[PDB]
Structure 1
Amino acid sequence: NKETDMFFLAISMVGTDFSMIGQLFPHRARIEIKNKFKREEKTNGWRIDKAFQEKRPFDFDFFAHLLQKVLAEEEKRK
């Protein structure tokens, strides 16, 4: 669930763009992200539309740290 939320969130920050999220995701390839998008477009189209109208910024720093903290939290809680 968390990974899906973050895939969405990055799709809003880095757009419908996959190689960079694969790069920042420790263990995801671009084909993986493309497949996530195929699977999710059928149901979450409205959220992906929410992904292209707000101008909140993107980073490595604030984000890289946010990724690592939420992944550690999820792994310790899962």
Structure 2
Amino acid sequence: EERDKLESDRKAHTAIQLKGTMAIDEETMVVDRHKNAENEYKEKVDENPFANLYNYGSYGRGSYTDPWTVEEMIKFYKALSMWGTDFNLISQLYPYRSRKQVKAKFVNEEKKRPILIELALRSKLPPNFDEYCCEIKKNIGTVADFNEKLIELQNEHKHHMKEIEEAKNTAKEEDQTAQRLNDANLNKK
């Protein structure tokens, strides 16, 4: 629509040199009175027709769901035979659903079936294909507890060293300010 209706990106930046120019380029800062002057920008882009619609009755929270896939159900029974009641891992194992709706799915599947769930808790399968799916479909690194623990310890040590260096720099600045105050008292008399 910017191509259709209409440089065009006339905005500001994090610094004061905004435009065109940063200042005058003839002899000195000439356009500093104009560079020192946000609300004048490009907005005539998104035009849409009107209506007199409504959203009443009940608006706000809710749940947009569907009749569930039977292949998703087979994957859920294989998962509960492989890696059980692990709400966060189950929400991550289906990474386009959400959290409260799969909790309603937990209580719904806890309702109707004792046999395959009892055989699932009988099974005790080791979690390798679950990590395979979680590392392919998400492309997450999953660094182990030694590497992640060492990285967290290194970050904590870097933060403690930065805090100690800031405290030492503040003490040195306070000592320099006390020396400057003593020098000003010596120069006042």
TM-score per shorter chain, which class? 0.5 to 0.7
Task: Write 1 or 2 for the structure with the bigger share of helix.
Answer: 1
Q: Larger relative CO (CA 8 A, sep 6+): 1 or 2?
A: 1
Residues 19-58 of structure 1, C-alpha deviation per residue, up to 9 Å, x if partnerless?
1021121212232221112112222121111111123221
Q: How far apart, in 1, do the equivalents of 2:100 and 2:110 lie?
A: 15
Paired residues in the alignment total 64
Contact 1:11 1:17 in 2 (8 A): no
Q: Which has the larger radius of gyration?
A: 2
5+ residue gaps, structure 1: 69-78
| Identical amino acids, percent of aligned pairs | 39
Does the alignment pair 1:43 with 2:98?
no
Deviation at 1:4, TM superposition (A): 0.8
> Which residue of structure 1 lines up, in the alignment, with residue 79 of structure 2?
10
> Which residue of structure 1 lines up, in the alignment, with residue 171 of structure 2?
none
Q: How far apart, in 1, do the equivalents of 2:71 and 2:127 lie?
A: 19
Aligned residue among 121, 131, 140 for 1:52: 121
5+ residue gaps, structure 2: 1-69, 138-189
Q: How far apart, in 2, do the equivalents of 1:30 and 1:17 lie?
A: 12
TM value normalised by structure 1: 0.66
Q: How far apart, in 2, do the equivalents of 1:19 and 1:42 lie?
A: 21
Q: How far apart, in 2, do the equivalents of 1:39 and 1:55 lie?
A: 22
Moved beyond 4 Å, runs of 4+: none
User: Cα RMSD over matched residues?
Assistant: 1.9
TM value normalised by structure 2: 0.31
